[PDB]
Every structure is written in structure tokens, then in C-alpha cells.
Design a protein around this ligand. Structure first.
Ligand SMILES: O=C(O)CNC(=O)C(=O)O
Ligand SMILES: O=C(O)CNC(=O)C(=O)O
Ligand SMILES: [Zn+2]
Ligand SMILES: [Zn+2]
Lengths: 335, 17, 335, 17
């Protein structure tokens, strides 16, 4: 259920701010970072919400005014859409699918321009939606540098070390409008997802649900995203979406969600909850083990399938020949 | 070492970078 | 049409000795080895019957009496069946499919034992069928050595050299009963198929008909053989068998059929034509080219599909997991 | 050289050997 805020502020959010979907879910555990069970979940690459890491404690004071005053004069990537769904797409792959027309568009702008566009949308009551999604880099102003340095590196560096992960590759700053949705997808890195402002409902699905979630082809710009429209699922094309079962939580300021590598996740900013702010922490996964144990884990089979698709696209010299060859291999032979 | 080759992980994420 | 034998012997065979099938065919060209068109067909890896190679001229005098007197005291592999279909199966793969029960069985015996079993079947009017299929080796007696040495090595060595083929790997001696059928399959070597006694109807299908002919999985004992029962084709499982088109010929004594690598072939000993004798000449194909041209040839796509199946069987540690992974890759994604 | 790897031919035939 919704957590009750300290100082008798009442529930932070209520069930009416969540979107309605076709599948059941069960809760992700919420634990203290000092809890042995939390350590066990991370070690076993299962999701857990940690409530008291202080991972981004200096950033809890961030709002638009503070950020605009201090985040510098760099360019920020801002996506715009006329739908609540901000489906990720890879611009380098759009040459493979000249028919793909994205529903959101990216515009580079300064942070004050982003705040002003937000304001102009609000005052005008327009329906346009904005989602800022920008890697934190060395153009940020001095106060953001000091905040960043004050993150809990002691705790997260120990996690990286304990799990055998590779390097931190980036920190993504995410600033969304109430009701924004990032559709279900999986990432090939480990993720500590640090909520700063507002509330996000996070629905995760394990790597073993691949067959229920129908990712796009690897060569498609929406590689790693589910083809299924969660708001209107097409059960004739995606019949096993009727078997999907999620793991759900709502994170608020101060919470950190461990999103394990390969785990599907659907993320939404609560309806009528105001803007949301998140900083994630992406780490490369640990090296492949010396001794492979059989049978393989689900995420290892996912990796195999990605590599088969990549190899065939390269070998056939044309991504579009991958599907026809796979169908020929299987029809009347394996199905 | 075909298995090691095939289970090699990528590192793609939903990042603009 | 049937060739007319020299000395006014009439047609060697008639259309009534051919089995009836569901697909159309067109004829394989019959040419002289001196014909530039024959050389062009071989170079382009298309089938051709050569009528005047003298490839196995010393063996044209072979019959059972001669062979039994001279072929030595080695063991010969003899397959037995209660059906006319001698479906090839690989005994080393039978551990992958404990449910596979072959319809023919192999027995090792001396050549005179094979002749005597033939005779006992004849006199008794039984329905058992025998097919001898034995690699020629150094146990053969002296007269067979002299015959073998008198094959036209000058001509076939020049072919090997001109085509860039690798080594001769074996010569298979085939002795069948009238009406025996080897079901459709392809071989991964180049084949000069030298007819010695009796007549065989040879139906070939190009490598591009893979999708009409439904080979067994690579790990199955009948790897490289069509799953389709040509006598009773199951069009619900194998719908593209309704699109198959063959290239047909009947070879008799003195003829050589070039069966190019990867080409499907169905081979039958004519009904009521007596026993048949063939010696084939298997050569490894030429090395893979330095510069791959795109798009790939059909046989190159066949090679890719075999290697994908082999890799997955090895990587998943279990052949039986190959089909499920391929289906998961494709369903709702590529089909 | 993934293409060269994948188009590598085998040499299996319908032989007892
Ligand atoms: O927060 C969002 O809307 C999307 N975030 C992610 O998918 C992520 O951090 O990996
Ligand atoms: O002659 C037969 O019945 C079978 N022969 C072959 O398939 C071959 O030579 O490759
Ligand atoms: Zn993500
Ligand atoms: Zn053959």
C-alpha cells in the first residue's frame, strides 16, 4: 500500500493515480540496506527497493528552480510527444526500418528553455508532454558538482565491488511530467534507480518472461522494448501476454530501486503527482563465469538470442533477411 | 568455446548516448 | 523419354516402371563430356548426365557372380527393410532421439552371404528388401583392384582440379533390389554418380527448395533427409511441398550423373528392372571464396542454418532445447 | 569474419562410414 509520510502528511499517493493494466502483480520488497535479505536479493539479481541508502541525499533538495540556477549551460536532450508513452528508439538503427515513424521527437535545448516550455504548456493547458533525459556530464555548475560528489559512493562502490560489476558507465537524469510512461523494456546493464522528486510506479518482469513480452527485432530502432501496447494489448499477435505477471512498487524521494540487468521494467510518473526527478546509476554486468552451469539461466538464453540475431544480420549482409531465414529454419522443422 | 561466445552480453540501455 | 538400346534391343525401360509422385519435373540434360554445355553445368553446380565418360568402364562387366568371386572376404554393410524406402539414418545421433525407431536395419555380412540372402528371398517370394551400401576399401580382391585402377581417373581428376574441389573422400558401392528407394536428402559433398547395372530414376531439387522439403533437425539421426513422405505427403505439416519442382533423369549402365553438393536427390531402382549397381565418387567441395558476394547463394544460406542449429545445440548443452529457443526468438517477433 | 565462420560447409553424406 501507499506509504504514510512522516509528520502526519498522509499518504504520499493513492491508488487512483495508477494506470490500469491487464496483468496481475505482486510487490517488490522494500527493505533497509542493512537488511541481509536486501543483500541476498541483489546478489541473486532480483529487484529490491532500498529505503535508506542516502545514495542521492544531496539531490533531494533539487527542483526546477535549483537545477536551472546551477546545472550549467549545457544542452539537454528533451523528448516531446502527444501521447503519455515515450517509447525509446535508437536513432542509428532507423536506416534499417525506413517505415518506422517515432511518436516522440528529441530536441536539444538549454535547461531554462526546458523549464519555459514546461511553463508555456501548463499556462496554455496544452496536451504536449515533455520528458528530459540527459546524461550528467562535466558541464554542470559547481553546486551540482558538489551535490554529485556528496552521493553515497561508499555504499554503491561497495555494491559494485561485491557483485563483480564493471564500471559505472553513466548517470542519467530523468525529469518527467505527471503521467509520463516509459514503456516496458530491458537494459543490458545493472541499474540503481534513485528517486529524487515525486513518485514513479515501477513494474518489473523477470528475464524468463521474454516469451510473454515480444521485444522488437534486434535491428529495429526499438530493440529491447516490448512490442505489446500495454494500454491495448493485441492478444492475437501476442497471446502469451495473457500470462505475464509483474513485480510492482512505487518509489518516492529517497528510495533506490535495484533494477537487475535484463529485467523488464515499465515506469510511470503518477497521474496528478507533479513532475518527477530520478537519477539512475548504470553499471556493466559482471564478466561471464569461468564454469557455465547447465541448464542456462533465462538471461543467458536472452543473450544467446540477441547474438544469433546480430550474427545473422551481419552474415546475410541485410537485417531484413534475418526473419525469413529464421522462419525457414523453423517451419515444419521445429514447430 | 562457442558457448562463451554466444552468451557474451552487450551493454545497450535506453540512453541518448 | 527412354533411350533406345543399341543393336535394336528396344527401350531399356518404360514409364510403367516409375513410381508416381505429386510434383512436376523437367529433364536433366544428357550430354557428352566433350560438350561445352556439360562443362558449363558442372562449373555452375547444376546437374548433368554425362553419357560417354568411361568413368567406370571396367566395372560394366560387374554382376553378382563376378563380384562374389573377386570382391574379397571383407564385411559389407547391408540394410534390410519391409518397405521400399531405405531412409538413411545416422547411428551416432540416435542417443539424441530415443524415440526414433528406424524402419531399416543394418547387418554386416560377407558378400556371398548377401547373394545367398537375396537368393533365399527370391526363391521364397518374400517381401523383405535388401540394399548393400559399402565403401570400397583395400580388402577387395585383385581383379577388383585392377578394375578400380582402370576407372577414368584422368577425366575425373581433371574435373576435381578444374572445380577446385578437395579430395576424393570415398567411393560407395550400392547394390539394390528392383523398387528400392533412397528418400530425398542432400549431401555435403560433390558427387559423380556412376551407374553400372540396371536403371535408377534420379529426381533432384535445387538448394533453393529447402523450404519445400523440410529436412529433419540437424541433431536428429535423419539430418539432411526430407521429412516429407513422398508417397503420402502431409500438406498440413509440409504445405510448401505443394510447390516443389524436380529435375529428373533415368541413368543406366555407362551414365554418370553429376549430383552437385547440397542438391536434394531422390533415387529409385526401377520397378521390375532387376538389381542395380552404382559406384559414386564423393569429393569435398571447394574452399569458401575470398570475397563473399551478396546476396548469398541458397546453398550458403543452408550452410548458415546448419551452423546455427549446431551452435545452439552445443551452447544450450542439450539438442532438445534448440527448437524451443528458436520458436521463442521468432514468435510474434519475426513471423 | 562472422560470415566466413557461418557459411563454413560440413562434409556429411549418406555413407555408413
Ligand atoms: O525512468 C524512466 O522513465 C525510464 N528509466 C529507465 O528505463 C532506466 O532507468 O533504465
Ligand atoms: O543410390 C542411392 O540409392 C543413394 N545414393 C546417394 O544418395 C548418393 O550417392 O549420394
Ligand atoms: Zn530502463
Ligand atoms: Zn545422396
Amino acid at each position: 500500500e501507499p506509504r504514510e509520510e512522516a509528520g502526519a502528511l498522509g499518504p504520499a499517493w493513492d491508488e487512483s493515480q495508477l494506470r490500469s493494466y491487464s496483468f496481475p502483480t505482486r510487490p517488490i520488497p522494500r527493505l533497509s540496506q542493512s537488511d541481509p535479505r536486501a543483500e541476498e536479493l541483489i546478489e541473486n539479481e532480483e529487484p529490491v527497493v532500498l529505503t535508506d541508502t542516502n545514495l542521492v541525499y544531496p539531490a533531494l533538495k533539487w527542483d526546477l528552480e535549483y537545477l536551472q540556477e546551477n546545472i550549467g549551460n549545457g544542452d539537454f536532450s528533451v523528448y516531446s510527444a502527444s501521447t503519455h508513452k515515450f517509447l525509446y528508439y535508437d536513432e542509428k538503427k532507423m536506416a534499417n526500418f525506413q517505415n518506422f515513424k517515432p511518436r516522440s521527437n528529441r530536441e536539444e535545448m538549454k535547461f531554462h528553455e526546458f523549464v519555459e516550455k514546461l511553463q508555456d504548456i501548463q499556462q496554455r493547458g496544452g496536451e504536449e508532454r515533455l520528458y528530459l533525459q540527459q546524461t550528467l556530464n562535466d558541464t554542470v555548475g559547481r553546486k551540482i558538482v558538489m551535490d554529485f560528489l556528496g552521493f553515497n559512493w561508499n555504499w554503491i562502490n561497495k555494491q559494485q565491488g561485491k557483485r563483480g560489476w564493471g564500471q559505472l558507465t553513466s548517470n542519467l537524469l530523468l525529469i518527467g511530467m505527471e503521467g509520463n510512461v516509459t514503456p516496458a523494456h530491458y537494459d543490458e546493464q545493472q541499474n540503481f534507480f534513485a528517486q529524487i522528486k515525486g513518485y514513479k510506479r515501477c513494474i518489473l518482469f523477470p528475464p524468463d518472461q521474454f516469451e510473454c513480452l515480444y521485444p522488437y527485432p534486434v535491428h529495429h530502432p526499438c530493440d529491447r522494448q516490448s512490442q505489446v501496447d500495454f494500454d491495448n494489448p493485441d492478444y492475437e499477435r501476442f497471446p502469451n501476454f495473457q500470462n505475464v505477471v509483474g513485480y510492482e512498487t512505487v518509489v518516492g524521494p529517497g528510495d533506490v530501486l535495484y533494477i537487475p540487468m535484463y529485467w523488464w521494467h515499465h515506469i510511470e510518473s503518477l497521474l496528478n503527482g507533479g513532475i518527477t526527478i530520478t537519477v539512475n546509476f548504470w553499471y556493466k554486468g559482471a564478466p561471464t563465469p569461468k564454469r557455465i552451469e547447465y541448464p542456462l539461466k533465462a538471461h543467458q538464453k536472452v543473450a544467446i538470442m540477441r547474438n544469433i540475431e546480430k550474427m545473422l544480420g551481419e552474415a546475410l549482409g541485410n537485417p531484413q533477411e534475418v526473419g525469413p531465414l529464421l522462419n525457414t529454419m523453423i517451419k515444419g522443422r521445429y514447430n | 568455446s562457442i558457448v562463451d561466445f554466444l552468451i557474451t552480453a552487450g551493454a545497450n540501455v535506453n540512453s541518448p548516448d
